[PDB]
Amino acid sequence: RQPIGLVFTLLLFGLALVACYHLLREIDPGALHDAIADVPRPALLGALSATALGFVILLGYEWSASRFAGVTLPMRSLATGGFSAFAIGNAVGLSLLSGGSVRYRLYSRHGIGAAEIARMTLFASLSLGCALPVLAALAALCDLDDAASALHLPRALVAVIAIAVLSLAVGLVAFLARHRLPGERPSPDSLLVRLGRRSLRLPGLRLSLLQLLITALDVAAAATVLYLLLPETPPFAAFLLVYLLALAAGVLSHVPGGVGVFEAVLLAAFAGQLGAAPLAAALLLYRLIYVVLPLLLACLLLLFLEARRLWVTRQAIRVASGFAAPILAILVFLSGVVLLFSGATPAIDTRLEHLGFLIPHRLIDASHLVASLIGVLCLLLAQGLRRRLSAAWALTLVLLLVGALLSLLKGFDWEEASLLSLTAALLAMFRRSFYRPSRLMEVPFSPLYVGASICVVGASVWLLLFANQDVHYSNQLWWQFALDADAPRALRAALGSCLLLLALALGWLLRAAPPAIREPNAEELQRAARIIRHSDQPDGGLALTGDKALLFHESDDAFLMYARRGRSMIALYDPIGPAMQRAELIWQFRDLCDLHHARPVFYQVRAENLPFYMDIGLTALKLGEEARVDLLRFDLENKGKEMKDLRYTWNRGQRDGLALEFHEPGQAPLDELKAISDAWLGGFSLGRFTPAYLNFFRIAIVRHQGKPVAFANLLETDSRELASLDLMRVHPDAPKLTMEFLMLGLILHYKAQGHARFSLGMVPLQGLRRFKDKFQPDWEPRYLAVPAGLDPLVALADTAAL
């Protein structure tokens, strides 16, 4: 899927480049520059305003999603989320930090469910995805002659196509209206439809109409931006029609920005009618104003919020797994783009002639080549920054500033140097955000980033051909070292960048295979047990069963237990140790998973570590509820119906002759345990009955008039914060209150030693819930972490099987 989808997009981009080259054959860069300069100031200020209007309409797009999913949020929060998600989706879609991710990051602070957000994003996407053809047909129906002229098709054909589209639209609307279940409504604005297999959620009539108006206003404003930039204006209907088609074509192409394809379509539509140069200039200004500008605004906004949050709340925020690393990766990538493009384009003559005196002539050529290499390194270090490396942050901070220096020593291009330096400032300001002390060579291969790198290099070479089209091909251009000669510098640069990218890509591809997963040995198990003791978490006990492999921190202070199942690696709980060790461990696991081409999954995680999973790109699903009784409040001289039932149970148990005794680890009656375990059997998160496992923990045994009837090992630490029990077996013939006596006896015993809390157990998603509730415990949600895209049930079913 991943390589196929990459290759498909890459080829589509490549084709669109070739199309644009063969379409702008007549135009030379001089003409284009003149066309760009031609545009009047009121037109620019108009487009700059229509951008704002069109982005304010995109807030309503988020409002419709909020209403559909039934999410109550503050208006300031909804606005911020809407703007930032749309801005960053539209520009760098699906490559870095998609709109969904930005929604899910921003809205998880308010404590909205992952399913709700997911639904919001899906609605926001499919809204445009399904309302695009309808608006295209509606626009086509106005002035068929103009539309036919634009598309270069017969009037009859486009007419019947429009009629066929609107007929299919109303037909589907009627069909879903037929299967409308009454009564139940998940939200005020939501219908449920029943087909037979699954119940699907569709918008209501009012919401559907309101979003369709919103979509209409959105695409209108978007098209108007591009309309104002054109000196000569074709009929609005046809223009809008083609814009819609082009937008569609760009989105389907799965090209990050829609660049290459969108421009190809517009140019093909109005190659002759509007000319090439004025259109190309309008397209560039459109892309700079409507895509690039908002993205940079969003980048700065979210950086600002992150910095403000860090400054205000200093103590609570410890590890910093916020919203800086992804933005900085984006800005760094853009920087590398800016370096590579500059390297392709020839310098200004005036700047070169001034510089020629100050700097030696060969240094310029050297500077230029190195600056091109640095550009490619900046492309590939985006991934590093994304994964919160510290090495990557150090290297990138150096390169961005060296690159900014060479940008002044290549042709005194201060516009480049300014941006590179500004980026390097922001990168240095967020120093804490990059903590991981891992090796850069250990970063996994990422097809996507390499794909994007190749695309950018392609676009640089395209720009090289288009810029240096006034020089004849010659073999002597390669060696030609002189000031005025721009084309040699570009050629050298392009070759150097192409070789360096190829080298690094091949080096990453051909690397030593990772070691296979093995079970832990005696030493590892002992270390794991040591870690568990010197910690708060007693749930770590299931590490010692020697059934699931162990990932150890470099400091051997904290560890994480995981097991491979099919194509997905599952981690049993949160990592065991201090917070700073936990974050590094969660990343370490993600790295490992990626190396082995497996989905990372975290089973039964607490709420406190959720943002660390959100970082590495997981989503929290409500798995179950975990009960824990607080022994400080709980006392044997308290009131409450359940409490009176418990004391009655305890008193009867004592009178009947039930005795509970605790055996230290090692000194256990293995014969009696084996007997009861066999009796219970006759009649991953489980805990085996191997003696080795049992000798680690102290076992509480209850006896009924002397004979051993039931037992339950106890997970403990050296601290007296929390205590839990994993394995717990009872004899089928035992009295019904015997298990409850054992259970309450445990609670009282831990009260005696003075443990703050006592972990009862988890209920997923009836009897177990009631039984746990009968002790009057404290409930706490337990989550499941799965990749964000689409893996809701497959992973849960697979884990349930395991």
Ligand X SMILES: CCCCCCCCCCCCCCCCCC(=O)O[C@@H](COC(=O)CCCCCCCCCCCCCCC)COP(=O)(O)OC[C@H](O)CO
Q: Is the Cα torsion angle 575, 581, 584, 585 positive or negative in sign?
A: negative
Q: Does 643 bind a copy of itself (CB under 8 A)?
A: no
- Alpha carbon distance, N-terminus to C-terminus of the chain: 26
Q: What residues from 61 to 120 belong to the interface with ligand X (CB under 6 A)? A: none
Beta bridge partners of residue 490, listed in sequence order: none
Query: Closer to ligand X at the Cβ: 241 or 459?
Result: 459
419 binds, among ligand X, a copy of itself, none (CB under 5 to 8 A by kind): ligand X
Q: Tokens for 380, please give them.
A: 């590939």
Query: Closer to ligand X at the Cβ: 260 or 496?
Result: 260
Which of 372, 342, 463 lies closest to 32 in space, CA to CA? Answer: 463
Beta bridge partners of residue 288, listed in sequence order: none
- Of 37, 74, 357, 476, the residue at the interface with a copy of itself (CB under 8 A) is 357
Query: Closer to a copy of itself at the Cβ: 51 or 537?
Result: 537
- Of 398, 607, 636, 686, the residue at the interface with a copy of itself (CB under 8 A) is 398
Give the integer Cα–Cα distance in Å for 238 and 218.
17
Q: Does 667 bind a copy of itself (CB under 8 A)?
A: no
- Of 334, 525, 528, 785, the residue at the interface with ligand X (CB under 6 A) is 334
Amino acid letter, residue 588? Q
CB under 8 Å to 69, separation ≥6 — which residues?
Answer: 116, 117, 119, 120, 123, 187
- The answer to whether the beta carbons of residues 263 and 32 sit under 8 Å apart is no
- Of 249, 331, 487, 614, the residue at the interface with ligand X (CB under 6 A) is 331
- The answer to whether the beta carbons of residues 701 and 664 sit under 8 Å apart is no
Shortest spacing between CB 628 and a copy of itself, in angstroms: 24
Q: What residues from 526 to 555 belong to the interface with a copy of itself (CB under 8 A)? A: 533-534, 555
> What's the residue count for the chain?
802
Query: Closer to a copy of itself at the Cβ: 321 or 367?
Result: 367
- x-or-dash string of contact with a copy of itself, 674-713, rule CB under 8 A: ----------------------------------------
Q: Does 421 bind a copy of itself (CB under 8 A)?
A: yes
Give the integer Cα–Cα distance in Å for 325 and 323.
6
- Of 4, 358, 510, 800, the residue at the interface with a copy of itself (CB under 8 A) is 358
Strand order in the sheet with 549-552: 549-552, 559-565, 568-571, 599-605, 778-787, 618-630, 757-764, 722-724
Q: Tokens for 638, please give them.
A: 């308290």
Neighbour count for residue 701 (Cβ, 10 Å): 20
- The answer to whether the beta carbons of residues 735 and 710 sit under 8 Å apart is no
Query: Closer to a copy of itself at the Cβ: 392 or 623?
Result: 392
Shortest spacing between CB 395 and a copy of itself, in angstroms: 8
Site of tokens 């539209």: 90
- Of 179, 201, 351, 751, the residue at the interface with a copy of itself (CB under 8 A) is 351
Stretch that binds ligand X, among 187-195, 245-253, 381-389, 458-466 (CB under 6 A): 458-466
Q: What residues from 646 to 665 belong to the interface with ligand X (CB under 6 A)? A: none
Q: Give the dihedral of Cα atoms 766, 769, 772, 773; nearest 10 deg.
A: -120
Q: What residues from 474 to 533 belong to the interface with a copy of itself (CB under 8 A)? A: 533
Stretch that binds a copy of itself, among 31-39, 402-410, 473-481, 496-504 (CB under 8 A): 402-410
- The answer to whether the beta carbons of residues 716 and 544 sit under 8 Å apart is no
- Of 51, 345, 545, 581, the residue at the interface with ligand X (CB under 6 A) is 345
Shortest spacing between CB 503 and ligand X, in angstroms: 25
- The answer to whether the beta carbons of residues 440 and 391 sit under 8 Å apart is yes
Phi, psi dihedrals of residue 442, rounded to the nearest 5°: -90, -5
Number of residues that bind ligand X (CB under 6 A): 30
- Of 138, 147, 191, 280, the residue at the interface with ligand X (CB under 6 A) is 280
338 binds, among ligand X, a copy of itself, none (CB under 5 to 8 A by kind): ligand X
Q: Tokens for 349, please give them.
A: 């003559």
CB under 8 Å to 22, separation ≥6 — which residues?
Answer: none
* 311 Rama sector, left if φ>0, alpha if ψ -120 to 50, beta otherwise: alpha
Q: Does 335 bind ligand X (CB under 6 A)?
A: yes
Shortest spacing between CB 262 and ligand X, in angstroms: 9
Query: Closer to a copy of itself at the Cβ: 194 or 533?
Result: 533
Q: Does 296 bind ligand X (CB under 6 A)?
A: yes
Give the integer Cα–Cα distance in Å for 104 and 307.
19
Give the integer Cα–Cα distance in Å for 50 and 43.
10
19, with CB counted inside 10 A (0-12, 13-18, 19+), is middle
- Of 292, 398, 482, 503, the residue at the interface with ligand X (CB under 6 A) is 292
Query: Closer to a copy of itself at the Cβ: 63 or 434?
Result: 434
- x-or-dash string of contact with a copy of itself, 645-664, rule CB under 8 A: --------------------
Instruction: Assign 3-class secondary structure to 694-721.
Output: HCCCEEEEEEECCEEEEEEEEECCCCCC
Give the integer Cα–Cα distance in Å for 789 and 787.
6
Q: Does 354 bind a copy of itself (CB under 8 A)?
A: yes
Query: Closer to a copy of itself at the Cβ: 324 or 450?
Result: 324
Stretch that binds a copy of itself, among 390-398, 492-500, 696-704, 794-802 (CB under 8 A): 390-398
- The answer to whether the beta carbons of residues 668 and 702 sit under 8 Å apart is no
Q: Does 459 bind ligand X (CB under 6 A)?
A: yes
Phi, psi dihedrals of residue 248, rounded to the nearest 5°: -50, -55
Q: Does 408 bind a copy of itself (CB under 8 A)?
A: yes
Q: Does 397 bind a copy of itself (CB under 8 A)?
A: yes
Query: Closer to ligand X at the Cβ: 18 or 213?
Result: 18
Q: What percentage of the chain's residues is helix, strand, coil (to nearest 5)?
A: 60, 10, 30
Q: What residues from 408 to 447 belong to the interface with ligand X (CB under 6 A)? A: 413, 415, 419, 422-423
Amino acid letter, residue 179? H
Query: Closer to a copy of itself at the Cβ: 555 or 638?
Result: 555
Give the integer Cα–Cα distance in Å for 99 and 128.
14
- x-or-dash string of contact with ligand X, 230-259, rule CB under 6 A: -----------------------------x
Give the integer Cα–Cα distance in Å for 615 and 619.
10
Number of residues that bind a copy of itself (CB under 8 A): 28
Q: Does 718 bind a copy of itself (CB under 8 A)?
A: yes
Q: Tokens for 61, please give them.
A: 């797009």
- x-or-dash string of contact with a copy of itself, 568-607, rule CB under 8 A: ----------x-----------------------------
Stretch that binds ligand X, among 53-61, 329-337, 353-361, 717-725 (CB under 6 A): 329-337
Q: Does 310 bind a copy of itself (CB under 8 A)?
A: no
Number of H helices, E strands in the chain: 29, 14
Give the integer Cα–Cα distance in Å for 342 and 330.
18
Q: Is the Cα torsion angle 269, 275, 277, 279 positive or negative in sign?
A: negative
Amino acid letter, residue 570? I
Query: Closer to a copy of itself at the Cβ: 337 or 405?
Result: 405
- Of 179, 201, 309, 431, the residue at the interface with a copy of itself (CB under 8 A) is 431
Q: Note the residues at the interface with a copy of itself (CB under 8 A).
A: 350-351, 354, 357-359, 394, 397-398, 401-402, 404-405, 408-409, 412, 414, 417, 421, 424-425, 428, 431, 533-534, 555, 578, 718
Q: Note the residues at the interface with ligand X (CB under 6 A).
A: 17, 20, 24, 259-260, 263, 280, 283-284, 292, 296, 299, 331, 334-335, 337-338, 341-342, 345, 347, 413, 415, 419, 422-423, 459, 462-463, 466
